Amino acid sequence: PASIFRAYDIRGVVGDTLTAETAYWIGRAIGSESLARGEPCVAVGRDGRLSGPELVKQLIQGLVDCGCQVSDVGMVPTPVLYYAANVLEGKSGVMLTGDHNPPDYNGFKIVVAGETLANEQIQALRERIEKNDLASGVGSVEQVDILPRYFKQIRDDIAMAKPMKVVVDCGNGVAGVIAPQLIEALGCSVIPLYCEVDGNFPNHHPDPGKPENLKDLIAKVKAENADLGLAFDGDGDRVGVVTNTGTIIYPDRLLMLFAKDVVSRNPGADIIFDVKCTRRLIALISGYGGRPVMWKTGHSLIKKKMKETGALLAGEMSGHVFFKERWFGFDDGIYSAARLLEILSQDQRDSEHVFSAFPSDISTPEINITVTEDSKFAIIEALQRDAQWGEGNITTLDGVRVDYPKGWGLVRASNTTPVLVLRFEADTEEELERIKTVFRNQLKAVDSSLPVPF
């Protein structure tokens, strides 16, 4: 089924669209692709899902039947798998994960020879299977215990000044295997919330991008008078943040704090953010002498862009934050949490006042309009072709973004759902609704039937 080969990764329903047999052939396809790039060595990890044991053995056998040398790192967060692919012999790795999709989902995040696959590169794996353009060989499997290396890597490079008390919510995802322990080892007291790994995800699904999944966290932070709240998503490559007073700090505001710190030590450094992030981030980066690079949404696309630009830091609005400075340049919520605590601990102000000090504007959440999968990209192309946007700085690298003096707006197509994704920001509520109006008029110009929920 080509439907499981997605823009950023592979994702399927275990049994239905993703079976044991398909996991094997995906392994052969990846192993074959790795060998074609001259990399026999592949690390393999999995998240906390129930299907993980079943499917990962098939992934591994697929790799091994190509002649690949597999390093099995067991059940780890996604960033720990990316880490393994940076410190072991090979620069390839596959993470078996369904991230924060419902329990029955699983999938693959794939790096081959240092490069995170996306778009045509993921299609190329399906194509190898169909064509039987597959390597055959007698590979090897080695058990590798990678967590302690990861844990010590971070701990030894992080220096907190003051002690902090932190609520850590892992939503019963695999971040529980290390984030509470690592964070404590930095010099914090950790209040654990849903830190037990449970593939059933009994409490709230680990999706920090939705405020409903941060309610328990916010509540505990306040109840325990904690210095900060942290939530990790299913596989640990997203982080969500809450202040001592329960304010949700969206990832583009988090990136402002990170950009200030990275740019400070690294004059001129390129800093990447996706099209969903506040314009205030463009200003800030530039004001500290950095180079802002706006790019496409999607972690694979962002990681590729970091290689093309030499960026020292990237972030997406969904909460993937990619440090190259002092790190390896992959997205990692657990490392980003540590880098955050390091910065906050130097400050005599509480976390609410650190973040409230930066400019904040009136801002919508991410807005979604469900359209048909047939129509979503065409709608955008129509907006790019047909629509007169004047006027503002118009960016078309991913959807249509328009930047004005006192605000901005975005419409893009999701690469994971049949939806249009919108965000609007302005200095004032008045300006915000004026930008909303323009976008609503332009969508209804393409198709008067289109839902416009804003």
Ligand X SMILES: O=P([O-])(O)O[C@H]1O[C@H](COP(=O)(O)O)[C@@H](O)[C@H](O)[C@H]1O
Where do contacts with ligand X occur on this chain (CB under 6 A)? 8-9, 99, 237, 297-299, 316, 318, 320, 414-417, 421
Complex with ligand X: residue 200 or 417, whichever CB lies closer? 417
What, of ligand X, Zn ion, none, does residue 298 touch, CB below 5 to 8 Å by kind?
A: ligand X
Q: Say which residues have a Cβ less than 8 Å from residue 449's Cβ, sequence separation at least 6.
A: none
Closer Cβ to ligand X, 100 or 220, answer by number: 100
Nearest approach in angstroms of CB 347 to ligand X is 28
From ligand X, Zn ion, none, interface partner of 316 (C-beta below 5 to 8 A by class): ligand X
**Closest separation between CB of residue 354 and Zn ion, Å?**
25
Q: Which does 332 bind (CB under 5 to 8 A by kind): ligand X, Zn ion, none?
A: none
Residue (374 or 429) nearer to ligand X, CB: 374
Interacting positions 281-320 with Zn ion (CB under 5 A): none
Quote the least distance from Cβ 234 to ligand X, whole Å. Answer: 8
Is 331 among the residues that bind Zn ion (CB under 5 A)?
Answer: no
Shortest approach of ligand X to residue 359 CB, angstroms?
A: 23
The least distance separating ligand X from the CB of residue 8, rounded to whole angstroms, comes to: 5
Beta carbons of 239 and 208 less than 8 angstroms apart: yes
Q: What is the 3-state secondary structure (H, E, C) of the chain?
A: CHHHECCCCEEEEECCCECHHHHHHHHHHHHHHHHHCCCCEEEEEECCCCCHHHHHHHHHHHHHCECCEEEEEEECCHHHHHHHHHHCCCCEEEEECCCCCCCCEEEEEEEECCEECCCHHHHHHHHHHHHCCCCCECCEEEECCCHHHHHHHHHHHCCCCCCEEEEEECCCCHHHHCHHHHHHHCCEEEEEECCCCCCCCCCCCCCCCCHHHHHHHHHHHHHCCCCEEEEECCCCCCEEEEECCCCEECHHHHHHHHHHHHHHHCCCCEEEEECCCCCHHHHHHHHCCCEEEEECCCHHHHHHHHHHHCCCEEECCCCCEEECCCCCCCECHHHHHHHHHHHHHCCCCCHHHHHHCCCCCEECCCEEEECCCCCHHHHHHHHHHCCCCCCCEEECCCCEEEECCCEEEEEEECCCCCEEEEEEEECCHHHHHHHHHHHHHHHHHHCCCCCCCC
Q: Which stretch binds Zn ion (CB under 5 A): 165-173, 227-235, 279-287, 351-359?
A: 227-235
d(CA 23, CA 107): 9
Give the interface size with Zn ion as a residue count (CB under 5 A). 5
Residues 6+ apart with CB under 8 A from 11: 4, 18, 98, 99, 101, 105, 106, 107, 416
Q: Which is nearer to ligand X, 280 or 320 (CB)?
A: 320
Minimum distance, C-beta of residue 322 to Zn ion, in the bound complex (Å) = 13
Q: Which residue number has the CB closest to ligand X?
A: 414
Nearer to ligand X, 128 or 299 (CB): 299
Using the rule CB under 5 A, which residue among 33, 169, 233, 431 binds Zn ion? Answer: 233
**Amino acid letter at 406?**
K
Task: Give which of Zn ion, ligand X, none residue 398 binds (C-beta under 5 to 8 Å, depending on kind).
Answer: none
> Which CB, 90 or 173, lies closer to Zn ion?
173
- Give the footprint of Zn ion on residues 81-120 (CB under 5 A): 99
Q: Decide: is 49 part of the binding site for Zn ion (CB under 5 A).
A: no
Q: Which is nearer to ligand X, 139 or 173 (CB)?
A: 173
Q: Which of 403, 380, 381, 399 is nearest to 390 (CA)?
A: 403
**Binding segment toward Zn ion, per CB under 5 A, in 147-155, 162-170, 237-245, 408-416:** 237-245
Closer to Zn ion at the Cβ: 91 or 205? 205
Question: At its nearest, how many Å lie between Zn ion and the CB of residue 13?
Answer: 18
For Zn ion, the closer of residues 318 and 345 by Cβ is 318
Residue 442 partner contact from Zn ion, ligand X, none using kind-dependent CB cut-offs of 5 to 8 Å: none
Of residues 64 and 182, the one with the C-beta less far from Zn ion: 182
Binding mask 130-149 for Zn ion (x = CB under 5 A): --------------------
Among 72, 207, 237, 252, binds Zn ion (CB under 5 A): 237
Residues contributing to the site for Zn ion (CB under 5 A): 99, 233, 235, 237-238
